Amino acid sequence: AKKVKVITDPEVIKVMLEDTRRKILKLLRNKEMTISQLSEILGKTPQTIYHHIEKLKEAGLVEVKRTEMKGNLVEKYYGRTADVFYINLYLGDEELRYIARSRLKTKIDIFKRLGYQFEENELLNIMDRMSQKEFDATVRISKYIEEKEDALKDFSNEDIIHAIEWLSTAELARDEEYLELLKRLGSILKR
Amino acid sequence: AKKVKVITDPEVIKVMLEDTRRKILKLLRNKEMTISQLSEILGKTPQTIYHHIEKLKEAGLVEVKRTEMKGNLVEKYYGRTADVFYINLYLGDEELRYIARSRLKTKIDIFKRLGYQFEENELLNIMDRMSQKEFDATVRISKYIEEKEDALKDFSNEDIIHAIEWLSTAELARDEEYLELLKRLGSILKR
């Protein structure tokens, strides 16, 4: 809706994950901005930002909120189409699966690079299985939220987000498999 | 250091938690900015932002990175003193404890307000006990990070943050009490 949105379209998700588009989206939570504004904040040139915004626009993640004539240039003000986005990273898309596998592996680089000794295979498998469940659960409780927005009219987004965490964590605390995955992780990620 | 910092000074922490100061800090991760810039983004007037910056400055959370003469006004550019801050919310300070109790209670409002039926006491106690451990653990693995920054020279902060999550989660997966708290939460936060 407006406070919360769960994206399951793989294509759009793939668009959202772009490092910079994520940043644009993050910043847009403050207020609707122009390409010029984003650009001065993000450290990216207007041309580059103009394109990112186009992808975001088509992914339906942002829309023109109004168009202002700022001097000799008419700029469009962009806003997010929902205060918060939740993505289904494990909704059967192969490429999304590898993207997730990649992100998780990066982390695994960090581990070993921090003096963490382990068998990267059992480990990645656990990261993934745990993360798959964390995403499905967060997708689960936020779905319910999308339909209970009127009821939240009196709360900020930072708190809604944190609320979804708990609920999500409670959802997880009820999966025997999850607790097993959790423990293995305990055993695995030495130090 | 520069990539990561664990704050345990209660006073400064209390300063960081101010809704707007958090936002200023969040935004400063992008680039060092002036009071004028923050103000145009945050939707707060320059006078109000000038003061927040003062608290942040004295809390050592931000410093003047350089001073630029922008026309008829000489502005200071502010930067965070560390890419990421980690706070010890449960470091024995009474007021910090209640602050935490408050935040958690807000969430509990959300729950019941979302059709979640339960005994707010056993619940808050669990939120707190779980959260106390989550903070101590994140404080624990990030401490080690503060001392391993050279090794991370090749990683972004979003990934470091996510790395600390796992490690932190693994730390948690090894506390029998935590797993018990986790389960209770599962039982408690119905739906």
CATH T-level assignment (fold) for domain B90-191 = Histone, subunit A (1.10.20)
Minimal C-alpha gap between B118 and chain A (Å):
13
Reading the block at residue A21, the tokens are: 């588009």
CB B7 within 8 A of CB B86: yes
CB A93 within 8 A of CB A10: yes
CB B64 within 8 A of CB B53: no
CB contacts < 8 A (A, B) = 122
CB A32 within 8 A of CB A77: yes
Cα A62 to Cα A33, A47, A114, B187: the distances in Å are 11, 17, 38, 39
d(CA A42, CA A1) in angstroms, rounded, equals: 27
What DSSP designation does B8 have? -
Map tokens 């993360």 to a residue: A131
CB contact under 8 A, A113 and B152: yes
Residues of chain B with CATH 1.10.10.10: 1-89
Minimal C-alpha gap between B8 and chain A (Å):
22
Q: What resolution in Å is listed for this PDB structure?
A: 2.7
Residues of chain B with CATH 1.10.20.10: 90-191
Q: Return the number of other C-beta atoms located less than 10 Å from residue A99's C-beta.
A: 16
Q: Per-residue DSSP letters for B114-149? A: TT----HHHHHHHHHHHHHHHHHHHHHHHHHHHTTH
Angle at A171 between CA A170 and CA A175, to 5 degrees: 110
- What is the CATH class of A1-89? mainly alpha
Cα B15 to Cα B21, B68, B75, B96: the distances in Å are 7, 27, 23, 11
Nearest to B163 among A37, A41, A111 (CB): A111
Residues of B in contact with A162 (CB under 8 A): 103, 107
Residues of B in contact with A40 (CB under 8 A): 37
